[PDB]
């Protein structure tokens, strides 16, 4: 039933989006926390999220509710995870791999991202901040 609805957006894209995790933080859509949110259609906004060492860029991830947000998260170092507490977003973030997930926030508030995937001694404190605008 999930594949027969827009709920399938919470599932990572089937298309491969491999890039260079070394310069992805210096050159590219993940090299600027300002132009991270780019409109890609009617009420559709693509947000590039860079998941580096114990951090997430941009932060806090401010996005509008009632719109289709195309989250494109990638890692420039080790493996990470994009599990937003309070949502259905649970996708793995690999190094140099752009995990694309389409979400639609129907409720505002502050959400914390839980990085399930290991990463150093402070992997448990790797909590990103998401703020959906009402």
């Amino acid at each position: 039933y999930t594949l027969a609805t827009h709920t399938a957006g919470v599932i990572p894209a089937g298309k491969l989006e491999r890039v260079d995790p070394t310069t992805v933080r210096q050159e590219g859509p993940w090299a600027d926390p300002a132009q991270a949110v780019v409109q890609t259609g009617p009420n559709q906004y693509t947000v590039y999220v860079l998941a580096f060492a114990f951090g997430y860029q941009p932060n806090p991830i401010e996005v509008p509710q009632g719109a289709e947000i195309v989250f494109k998260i990638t890692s420039p170092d080790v493996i990470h995870g994009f599990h937003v507490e309070g949502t259905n977003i649970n996708v793995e973030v690999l190094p140099g791999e752009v995990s694309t997930v389409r979400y639609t926030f129907k409720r505002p508030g502050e959400y914390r991202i839980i990085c399930n995937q290991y990463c150093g001694l402070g992997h448990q404190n790797m909590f990103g901040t998401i703020v959906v605008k009402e």
Binding site: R25, Q26, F52, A53, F54, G55, Y56, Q57, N59, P60, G120, L121, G122, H123, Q124, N125, M126, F127, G128, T129
Partner: protein, 129 residues
């Protein structure tokens, strides 16, 4: 040099040295605060080599992140960025007799394998919440 490594600091603390509220603490007008403490300079190196991880409260603002363990960088590089940031904002000019970070101080700490989770205690021991 210090500028080359500064590019890495900009990834979280930005080029403004303000950071992100609730994620990354500020450096401008904060390094001097630590440099004035007994062992504050050592902490600055430890927080770079290994890091820190908790919910520190700077100026009443609490965060929830982790310092990046720049152990992959050379001792000279680690000291270079420290000297660069301290002189960049001029925080090193707000202390009496600022001693430039030397690779020697980095080496002595690099030999002592610690964890960012343990550094949290060391930081709080200095009175830093």
């Amino acid at each position: 040099d210090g500028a080359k490594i500064y590019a890495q600091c900009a990834g979280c603390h930005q080029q403004n040295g303000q950071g992100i509220p609730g994620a990354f603490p500020p450096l401008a007008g904060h390094v001097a605060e630590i440099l004035a403490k007994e062992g504050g300079r050592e902490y600055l190196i430890l927080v770079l080599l290994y890091g820190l991880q908790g919910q520190i409260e700077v100026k009443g603002m609490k965060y929830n992140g982790v310092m990046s363990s720049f152990a992959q960088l050379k001792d000279e590089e680690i000291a270079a960025v420290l000297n660069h940031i301290a002189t960049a904002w001029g925080d090193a000019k707000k202390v009496k007799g600022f001693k430039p970070f030397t690779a020697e101080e980095v080496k002595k700490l690099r030999a002592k394998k610690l964890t960012p989770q343990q550094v949290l205690a060391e930081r709080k021991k200095l009175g830093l919440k």
